[PDB]
Amino acid sequence: VILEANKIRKSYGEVLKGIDIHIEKGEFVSIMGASGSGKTTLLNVLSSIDQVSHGTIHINGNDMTAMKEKQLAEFRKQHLGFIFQDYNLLDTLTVKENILLPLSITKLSKKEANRKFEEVAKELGIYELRDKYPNEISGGQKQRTSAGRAFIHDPSIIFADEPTGALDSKSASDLLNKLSQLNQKRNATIIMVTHDPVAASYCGRVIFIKDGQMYTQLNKGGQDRQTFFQDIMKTQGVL
Amino acid sequence: VILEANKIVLKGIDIHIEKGEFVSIMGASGSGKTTLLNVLSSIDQVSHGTIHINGNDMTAMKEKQLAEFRKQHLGFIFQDYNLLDTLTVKENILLPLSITKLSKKEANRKFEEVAKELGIYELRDKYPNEISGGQKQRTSAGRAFIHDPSIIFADEPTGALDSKSASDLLNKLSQLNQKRNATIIMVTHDPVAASYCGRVIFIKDGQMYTQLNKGGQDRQTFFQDIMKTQGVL
Amino acid sequence: MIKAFLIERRSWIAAFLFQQALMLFIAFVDPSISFGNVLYMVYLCILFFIIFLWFRYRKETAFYKSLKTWENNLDVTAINEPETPFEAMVERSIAGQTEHLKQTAARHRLALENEK
Amino acid sequence: MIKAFLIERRSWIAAFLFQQALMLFIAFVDPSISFGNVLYMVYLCILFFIIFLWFRYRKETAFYKSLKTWENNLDVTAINEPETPFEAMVERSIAGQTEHLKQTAARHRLALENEK
Amino acid sequence: MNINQLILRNLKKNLRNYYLYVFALIFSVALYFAFVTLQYDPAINEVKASIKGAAAIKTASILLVAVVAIFILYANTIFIKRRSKEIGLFQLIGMTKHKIFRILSAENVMLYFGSLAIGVAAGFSISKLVLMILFKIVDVKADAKLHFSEQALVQTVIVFCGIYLLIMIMNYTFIKKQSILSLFDKVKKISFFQMLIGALGIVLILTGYYVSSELFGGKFKTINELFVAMSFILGSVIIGTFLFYKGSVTFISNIIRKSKGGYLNISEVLSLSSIMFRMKSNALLLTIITTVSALAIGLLSLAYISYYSSEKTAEQNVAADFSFMNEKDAKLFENKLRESNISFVKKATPVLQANVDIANIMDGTPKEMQGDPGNMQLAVVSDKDVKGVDVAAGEAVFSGYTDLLQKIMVFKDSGVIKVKSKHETQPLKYKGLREEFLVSYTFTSGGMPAVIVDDSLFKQLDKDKDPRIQLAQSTFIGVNVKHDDQMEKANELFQQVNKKNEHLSRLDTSAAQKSLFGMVMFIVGFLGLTFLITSGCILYFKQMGESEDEKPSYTILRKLGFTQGDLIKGIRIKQMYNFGIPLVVGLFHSYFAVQSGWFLFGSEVWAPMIMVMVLYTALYSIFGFLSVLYYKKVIKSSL
Ligand SMILES: CCCCCCCCCCCCCCCCCC(=O)OC[C@H](COP(=O)([O-])OCC(O)COP(=O)([O-])OC[C@@H](COC(=O)CCCCCCCCCCCCCCCCC)OC(=O)CCCCCCCCCCCCCCCCC)OC(=O)CCCCCCCCCCCCCCCCC
Numbered sequence A: 001v002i003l004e005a006n007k008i009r010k011s012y013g014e015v016l017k018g019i020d021i022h023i024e025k026g027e028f029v030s031i032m033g034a035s036g037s038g039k040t041t042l043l044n045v046l047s048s049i050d051q052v053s054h055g056t057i058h059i060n061g062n063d064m065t066a067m068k069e070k071q072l073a074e075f076r077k078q079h080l081g082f083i084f085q086d087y088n089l090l091d092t093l094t095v096k097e098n099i100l101l102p103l104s105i106t107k108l109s110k111k112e113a114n115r116k117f118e119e120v121a122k123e124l125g126i127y128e129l130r131d132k133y134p135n136e137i138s139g140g141q142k143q144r145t146s147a148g149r150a151f152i153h154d155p156s157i158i159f160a161d162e163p164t165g166a167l168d169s170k171s172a173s174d175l176l177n178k179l180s181q182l183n184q185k186r187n188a189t190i191i192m193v194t195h196d197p198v199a200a201s202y203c204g205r206v207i208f209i210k211d212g213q214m215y216t217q218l219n220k221g222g223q224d225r226q227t228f229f230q231d232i233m234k235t236q237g238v239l
Numbered sequence B: 001v002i003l004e005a006n007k008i009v010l011k012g013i014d015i016h017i018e019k020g021e022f023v024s025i026m027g028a029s030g031s032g033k034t035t036l037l038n039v040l041s042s043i044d045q046v047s048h049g050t051i052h053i054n055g056n057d058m059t060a061m062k063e064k065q066l067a068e069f070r071k072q073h074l075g076f077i078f079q080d081y082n083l084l085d086t087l088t089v090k091e092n093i094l095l096p097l098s099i100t101k102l103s104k105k106e107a108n109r110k111f112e113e114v115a116k117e118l119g120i121y122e123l124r125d126k127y128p129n130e131i132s133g134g135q136k137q138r139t140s141a142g143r144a145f146i147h148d149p150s151i152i153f154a155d156e157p158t159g160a161l162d163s164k165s166a167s168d169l170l171n172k173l174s175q176l177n178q179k180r181n182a183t184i185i186m187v188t189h190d191p192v193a194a195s196y197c198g199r200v201i202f203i204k205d206g207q208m209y210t211q212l213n214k215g216g217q218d219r220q221t222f223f224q225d226i227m228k229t230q231g232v233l
Numbered sequence C, D: 001m002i003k004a005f006l007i008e009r010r011s012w013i014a015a016f017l018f019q020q021a022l023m024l025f026i027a028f029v030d031p032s033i034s035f036g037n038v039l040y041m042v043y044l045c046i047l048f049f050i051i052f053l054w055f056r057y058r059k060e061t062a063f064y065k066s067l068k069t070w071e072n073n074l075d076v077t078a079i080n081e082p083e084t085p086f087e088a089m090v091e092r093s094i095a096g097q098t099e100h101l102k103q104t105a106a107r108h109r110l111a112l113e114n115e116k
Numbered sequence E: 001m002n003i004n005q006l007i008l009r010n011l012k013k014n015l016r017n018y019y020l021y022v023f024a025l026i027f028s029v030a031l032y033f034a035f036v037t038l039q040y041d042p043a044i045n046e047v048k049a050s051i052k053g054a055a056a057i058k059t060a061s062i063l064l065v066a067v068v069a070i071f072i073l074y075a076n077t078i079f080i081k082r083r084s085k086e087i088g089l090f091q092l093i094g095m096t097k098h099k100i101f102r103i104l105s106a107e108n109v110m111l112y113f114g115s116l117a118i119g120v121a122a123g124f125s126i127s128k129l130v131l132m133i134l135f136k137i138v139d140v141k142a143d144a145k146l147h148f149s150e151q152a153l154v155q156t157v158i159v160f161c162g163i164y165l166l167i168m169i170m171n172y173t174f175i176k177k178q179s180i181l182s183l184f185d186k187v188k189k190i191s192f193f194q195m196l197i198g199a200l201g202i203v204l205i206l207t208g209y210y211v212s213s214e215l216f217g218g219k220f221k222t223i224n225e226l227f228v229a230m231s232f233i234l235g236s237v238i239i240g241t242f243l244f245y246k247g248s249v250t251f252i253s254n255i256i257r258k259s260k261g262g263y264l265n266i267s268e269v270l271s272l273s274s275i276m277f278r279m280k281s282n283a284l285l286l287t288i289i290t291t292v293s294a295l296a297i298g299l300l301s302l303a304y305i306s307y308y309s310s311e312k313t314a315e316q317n318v319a320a321d322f323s324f325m326n327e328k329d330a331k332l333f334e335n336k337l338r339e340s341n342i343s344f345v346k347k348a349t350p351v352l353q354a355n356v357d358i359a360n361i362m363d364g365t366p367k368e369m370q371g372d373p374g375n376m377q378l379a380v381v382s383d384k385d386v387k388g389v390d391v392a393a394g395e396a397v398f399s400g401y402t403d404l405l406q407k408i409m410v411f412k413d414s415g416v417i418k419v420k421s422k423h424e425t426q427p428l429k430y431k432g433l434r435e436e437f438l439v440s441y442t443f444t445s446g447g448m449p450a451v452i453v454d455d456s457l458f459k460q461l462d463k464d465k466d467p468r469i470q471l472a473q474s475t476f477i478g479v480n481v482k483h484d485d486q487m488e489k490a491n492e493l494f495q496q497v498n499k500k501n502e503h504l505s506r507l508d509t510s511a512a513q514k515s516l517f518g519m520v521m522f523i524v525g526f527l528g529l530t531f532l533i534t535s536g537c538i539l540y541f542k543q544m545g546e547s548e549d550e551k552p553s554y555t556i557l558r559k560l561g562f563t564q565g566d567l568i569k570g571i572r573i574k575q576m577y578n579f580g581i582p583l584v585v586g587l588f589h590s591y592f593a594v595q596s597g598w599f600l601f602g603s604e605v606w607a608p609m610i611m612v613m614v615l616y617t618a619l620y621s622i623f624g625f626l627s628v629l630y631y632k633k634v635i636k637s638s639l
């Protein structure tokens, strides 16, 4: 495992009341529920955004809490990736230098940096837009280059708070297919929160949370999309 | 009717809005969404067409006199959080009422009620420069509503707001509109903020071709409903 | 608050004024040094020192004055962030004070809920 | 900690240096007063100021050195009694929150036995 | 709340934010009050120079007002422009266009007049200091007193009240011309027009620099050609600088970004996000700042060059400690020093004036200098007259380096030099490149050297001497005295002799040069210091507005994972480029302007000029550091 939470609980509110979480390497999972039920707050506590009051969390065997703000900055910038729903891009920078924004702090040679980008861009279908400013590309490309930025340094755990929050049906399907293919060929575990079962259908395990409690463990089962799409639909409707 | 546009400068649009109907206009860069708002807000840019706010005749003489009907009967919400740095949150809401010689007690529970429904009371005396942008935008919306008006104009309020602040602000506005009926004329550039409303009109060059209204479907269904319409343009 | 600031910085302002007082003594005893020009020269530095003291009063007492919030019963909010190392250590101890208190209360609350 | 105290009083260090810079500039420009006597006195004043600076650091920073009692289980060690008003207010706030920690532990111990 | 409380709160925010503006206003008021006090101070008449002290100060006083009113008007213009957001909000509140103006005027009055009163008190305190500074610079011994003059207070009140009247008119016309609709891409590729502008800006700058390198080489002959060249180089530099800030800076920034590839660190994001798109938005402001700063540095360095070499130049124009035109006054003067128990030596060196053809050894074209090398007046000194190097028959020596002489007169090391007297000419040969100057500039020209010939030839042509070429003197009288402290006693005794001021003393010439150029240095240095404060404050305010425009970029960077400390390093590099590019081009303009005219003033150029930039850069980097502190505050509050 690479993630482990031992009854993680947030006293603010009470949003989290103790939930056990754990995932395996190279796994596609989603956590969701009702609006305002605390699904978003899980990403802010699993990542070191607002810390926590009760419980402990482990990332790749290393403690995710009980640290100061000095080495915490290094940990997020090295082992954690973020795919925000808002593009969070820079208008002054083109796609090429926007993707290689976080890789700069690593301070590696340009020879390998131009090789990592080529592998990432060819695996995302965004190579042709290597020198196009964000204002000259569609919203789907903006999300794709945001995903490439999170995947450029090959982290361990990547959080995607509603990646398809502003994308069309075709763009959401294309991004999800790219992300699922990227995870399979890179063996990097990604977790996300989704308000729609269509985006979370590409997952392997689906677990729902509200008022800080854990319900069910929806294993994929290794069948086609038809079985999983109906299963996630009926469970969400019942819940 | 409440706000009826008759050949409304643009090429002439005939729209019909009832009381407390959240609406949004969708256009392109060359369509002139901001220009339509300015003519709809109807202060300076007015050449042809008439705007009837509950049957009131328009084009009296001047914008300064047009400024004093909107002072008492029109709120304004913007994207830059037009909040005075020196002013406190409580005083910022009470700033429009400070000019009029009031008892200074009527503004008290009026601020209390606004801070109870919308919710600003937790930071009543907190300066705007030391709070997040999600609360400054919310405070500006409350400042507009202190004029107890029936029509509120708000251009792209979720311009400098993230997704969380945009979603938080819109649901606050949506329930506030339900609490007190008041038409909220708004313009939008991102379809995310154009789904919480109840009616969207698309302008390609300044005309009303197709309008989309919600119903049993909402949110994601409405979001993709206007995506195909915007993709048509 | 002015009285407290002046009492603390009594040694420092005495050191600044000691050299000015020294000049008014040697000038009054050295024929080669004119007292009138020294008096203007001392006056220019006194004017600068007074302005410097007033500027440093607000900067060096802003943190400690806001620290009075913790002492009284309005301790339900936060204080201004530290900017200089000495008051940073005070804030660090204050921050360690709340974290230990929060940890103790959380642990005690968990034990109380466990026996129910 | 030398690098911390110097950053603390860098404004006062600069003010004294600027005062000496003005002290030299007026003496050099003005012909009535000498410059050699001022130069010799400034060197003596700087040497005295350095000695005073070391003496001031040793006496003043001692309280903040003892403030490191919360790094480990050294919490039992008592903070030295402060003298300056700034440190007195800091100690009063620390004592106030310590009593706050004492009273909440008693309240929880009251609640734990009351529930029984 | 009440309007009065809002006005007081607005004043507190303005004082906290625009503290540099208040300091600049106080400094300008205090400096102007001191200057007016100096003008009417009766002790200022003790200075003696070509230009009167009162007239020079009055001219500086007028220049100081212009350089301050322009800064004040511009600063207030951008203050209201950045306040236009709350201006429109007030119009939306319901107040008429007069009440909002009254609120703005009331806040401005309580701030402008408050700083004016403080500045008057500061000016009264520093009035003695600037007077002592001027006396020390021009080297005059007198008593400086601290007094308060009613006229100076009246004059500074009237001028600054009139300045604020212009501010009120500008503020009022801004409110009236702005309607309600006032409270609500930049990034693109490089176009062909930007290509031509960028290349032309560099070409024009280098073209002007090359012309300066060959300005006095000898290409131009007449004064009209020199004047039209000066107009061309001034125009080329100004146009080139304006084009450099407009399109050239974008291309250089674009080139390095492309060369660096797509791998840009944090420092290369913030730095390259401003100079590409914000430098060209205020090209005119940057060009004016760069041009005036370069002119101020150039004038200050040239004045210091003359001041540094004033003693050498005074020794240059003379040949001894004293120069006498007639023998009768020498007899009167020698007896005065004889009874003063001071040993002195009087030297009598006859000189000869004639026409000499030097074009045979004049390197290159003989049209470089203003005149005819074939027929020109050259001082001739006999071999026995001086005690330098013995000269044989058929040989000559040229004495006097006089660096300006060498550039205009590019001497060679060998050749045949032809002297054309009233009778048969004689051919000589010279080496040149000497130092000791045997003839004072009262017979020979300021830069023209003196030829040395064997005494046998000098005694030969005594009967055949040109009457056409001889001024009045022939024999030259030079008086020197023992030690150095006797200079003052001799000078004070020599003053009563030259009642008609027909003589010429080394000390008097040095003192006159010291006072004249010292006053110019005092005027230029203080005016440049005032411009330095105003330019730094203006650039600080421009960075203040730019910082608010870049707040969303900092928010995105913080959300990505970059810490505040990481952004500090990028900001420091970006501010270094923003505050360094105008300085670097400004220093380059000053250096190439001084290098083209340094020989016209003195002999040492490297030491005084280096000190000026070093002093200027140190006092200019303070505003850059203050801008960094403001940027640190902004990014701290960004998220
Ligand atoms: C031999 C060699 C020797 C050589 C000798 C000389 C040596 C060389 C020179 C030395 C240069 C080095 C200096 C660098 C140090 C930098 C300072 C620093 O670290 O500050 C950081 C720090 C910044 O911190 P921060 O985190 O950004 O905090 C933000 C502010 O602090 C927030 O603001 P705040 O609250 O702290 O302050 C607000 C406000 C507070 O002030 C006030 O509120 C009081 C004044 C308000 C005025 C308005 C009145 C309002 C009330 C009136 C109401 C009633 C009136 C009604 C009217 C009538 C109507 C009816 O401040 C001001 O605006 C005050 C202005 C400064 C007062 C000084 C006046 C100038 C004296 C004249 C000089 C004379 C020289 C003449 C020529 C000399 C020739 C020999 O600065 C401060 O703390 C602020 C201090 C104020 C400015 C000080 C710096 C000076 C400006 C820099 C100039 C650049 C230097 C270039 C050359 C020098 C000048 C020519």
Ligand SMILES: CCCCCCCCCCCCCCCCCC(=O)OC[C@H](COP(=O)(O)OCCN)OC(=O)CCCCCCCCCCCCCCCCC
Binding pocket: C044, C047, C048, C051, C052, C055, C056, C059, D010, D011, D012, D014, D015, D018, E126, E629
């Ligand atoms: C040679 C060319 C002409 C030069 C003319 C110069 C005229 C005087 C202009 C003012 C120059 C002051 C220089 C000496 C300052 C010494 C104090 C100092 O440097 O303090 C630094 C400190 C800010 O640093 P800190 O508190 O560490 O916080 C950093 C983040 N904010 O600062 C502070 O906390 C603020 C307090 C210090 C700044 C204000 C001081 C103003 C003094 C003006 C009095 C002028 C007296 C007459 C001068 C005669 C003419 C020179």
